[model samples]
Target: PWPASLAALALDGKLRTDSNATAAASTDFGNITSALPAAVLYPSSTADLVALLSAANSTPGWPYTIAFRGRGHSLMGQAFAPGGVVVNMASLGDAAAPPRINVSADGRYVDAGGEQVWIDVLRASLARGVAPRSWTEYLYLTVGGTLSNAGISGQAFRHGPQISNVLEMDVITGHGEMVTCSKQLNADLFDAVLGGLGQFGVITRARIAVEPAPARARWVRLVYTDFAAFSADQERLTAPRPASFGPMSYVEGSVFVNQSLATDLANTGFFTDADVARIVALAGERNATTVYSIEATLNYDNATAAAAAVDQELASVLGTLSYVEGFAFQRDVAYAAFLDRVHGEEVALNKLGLWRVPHPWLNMFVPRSRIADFDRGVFKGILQGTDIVGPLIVYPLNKSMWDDGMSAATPSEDVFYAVSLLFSSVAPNDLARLQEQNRRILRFCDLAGIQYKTYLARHTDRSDWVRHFGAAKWNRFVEMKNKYDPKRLLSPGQDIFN
Candidate 1:
């Protein structure tokens, strides 16, 4: 039953109790599962949200819990709120000046709306001749959504994940209080919100570090037959910028089965990145199994000049790495285009009905010591059963950059790898098999004692989550939950508490 106290609040926002409007809020882009929310609100102002939370906190028997939704991109129903009020954060974008950006007086950072998509920030900052240092390749994600999880991509290796880039945030806590927090003030809340998985507050705005966006970029891909060689090369990319021109401006890799790649992506050539002709012949049609791959980029101020004059510089760097020569490929894209590269593929996939399909995506981080073993068993062995039709992304990060206070976890070691299995499209009936296959991969890791943590993690039970967070962090998280939302009136979909 809907709470009567909610009806007492002064609300300028649009509220819908109709099933038709709330239906779409039930699932996310991954569409792995659906749990219909009882109502959805398009918040017009922060006061409207305050009223809603105040009601939840003040009403003793109020049954409706609230979860904030941002583009609904979560893979495992993290944003859904069954039989509860779902806040459509995108509605905040309708403000007279939403995603309003400001260059700090010091010119060191920019302030952005937590409700806004990352692409909005990119556009605004680029227009000012600057951009954020870290990114997620796909930019439609909201700042609040990704920061709540650890936002990552190729650039994370260079600048650290988006969580590390935050300066401060204005968040509305679970107890109907609005507050501003950062490393200096209300610091604990600041840490919790960074990768707290929305267990604490609704972020309204954020301050982000910014730098001059690169004017141009040279993108290249290299393939390795040997895993050890590939790992060494990938790590070498982040070795520091002593000469101003570092080893590589960006670093990322993928696990691709040679035979499957030719067919799945029809992928070869310089522009199309596909050439059945050359790859089939040069690599000797062996098209065997998993090609250890690395993708890197270097930037230039003159933009076009970066591509026009970098071949000699590129060859010098390539000579140090051990990837096979015949299997190499390269491309030049405008810095903006390079950053926005995934948008084109996304448009194409949607046209093919591939974009909205059930994606049984599995993303995790493995310690550097165990990554080779992981590559050997999971990619080289377990997943060989079915041809993975999409990206098998893998890359390394420095643990020294990650914050100890934030909820995102990593091995205590100095280095780690982020590996993601994005199984884009599968027939509905076949999704279960792929999901089971994902489980087998995890099962193998645990049995082998390979330490790993799921990124954008999900677990069906509280004990599993307790184990994921470990006892110390888990206890801290619960203390905050009880203090800020003692009624347990927020984000029931996350299932941290009953």
Candidate 2:
């Protein structure tokens, strides 16, 4: 029998058992796995979460696990509940309540609800002439969703990750305790909740670090035929620099394997047909099995005097890199447009019914020392013959920018590269093949003894999970789980405790 508290809420329509609700929560963006939850809770406010979690905590033999679904952006059923309860987190954005996003008067930080999408955050902050310093490549993701997994983008090299930029957060723990935590107050909960994978608690409110919003961006992509030169140039551009506009504001890169070079370049939505033809001709002329492009941006306020120096500053930075001569393609756009570039691709693909396909994406943090080996083996070898559908991204990040104390794992080296193979399955049998391809890539990494950690990926076995996090971090993670979620009822889809 359901607990009295939950039953009361169910009678009041706060908890839903309708097929429509459960069906909507069954699958995520991955379209690979399906899990039917027993019930769904459309939380109109934070108090509703407290009621559900408190019941789960206080009730004897609580039968239902809980998962908070924010935009359902998870790729591997990480947001599923699997015959338990799924909290529709976006419903917390109620018009009757006060505004969910509130920017500080001094313009240092913005307090946004956990369910708030970053696109709304950008719009609200830009209205005040201030915006968050760190972001994801796609701004439609929920702040809580991304913060739970270490929100990263090209800006992460300079201004740490989105989790690192958080000033504080209000988390509702599994025990149903609503705690306001920061580096100073309730420090352990604060650290555990950031990148804790929605296992410890629900982030109801997050105070994100912000800065004066720039108006325009000077974006460029520099092409290279050699992986060595491409990676080296990327690392050089992301290296620590003094306070100046001399260096690029954002730095990221992409890998174009020979088999799908032309098609993938066109899919990027950055290059013109003439530009794509030229890059393809360059790859052919160089006899390159794989090509690389360093994508970067320089931000400036339209009204500021620095706007006049954007070209000169960009030129100065480009002179130091080792990209192919006469291969730099440039564009000028609004800062927000550059930051939210992926949404445009999503809109275009949605029109063709390709956006909802199965995505067996694999992302990893490859150590700087072994990046060349990885490129040679994966990009130039395993991926050379495949028909890749999406962008295969490769970019470097400074290890110093990440906090070792946080739950998000990374390569221990001073620098590491973010290698994301975003594969989409369109044909009927494509899903299995892509899944197998991911395993093969992982197998190669294991056999080569490369110390790389997967990002936005899920594991089923206990040993694999332990190895993903080292012995020490694994112990710490367990300790956090024991303390914050003793019953192991939160986010069962993570398959960590379940």
TM-scores of the candidates in the order shown: 0.93, 0.98
Point out where model 2 deviates above 4 Å. 1-5, 242-246
lDDT of 2 by residue, 1-498 (tens): 556766777887978989998999999999999999999998878888988999889988888899989899999999999999999999889675689999998999999999999999999999999999888999889999999999989988888889899999999999999999999999899998888899999999999999999898999999999988988888888887663223678889998888888888987889999999999999999999999999999889877577668878888888898888899999999988888889888999899999999999999999999999998889889887788888898898888889989889898998998888889897767999899989999999999999999998888988988988899999999999999999999998888899
- TM-score of model 2 (CA atoms): 0.98
Per-residue lDDT of 128-200 in model 1, one digit per residue for the tens? Answer: 8888989897989999999999899887777889999999999888888999999999998898888888878
Q: After superposition, how far is residue 474 of candidate 2 from its true place, in Å?
A: 0.9
Candidate 1 at residue 335, lDDT?
A: 84
RMSD of 2: 1.4
Give Cα distance to truth, residue 178, candidate 2, Å.
0.4
Report residue 33 deviation for candidate 2 (angstroms).
0.2
How does candidate 1 fare on TM-score?
Answer: 0.93
Clash counts per candidate, in order, are 6, 0
lDDT accuracy of residue 397 in candidate 2: 85
User: In candidate 1, where is summed lDDT lowest over 10 consecutive residues?
Assistant: 265-274
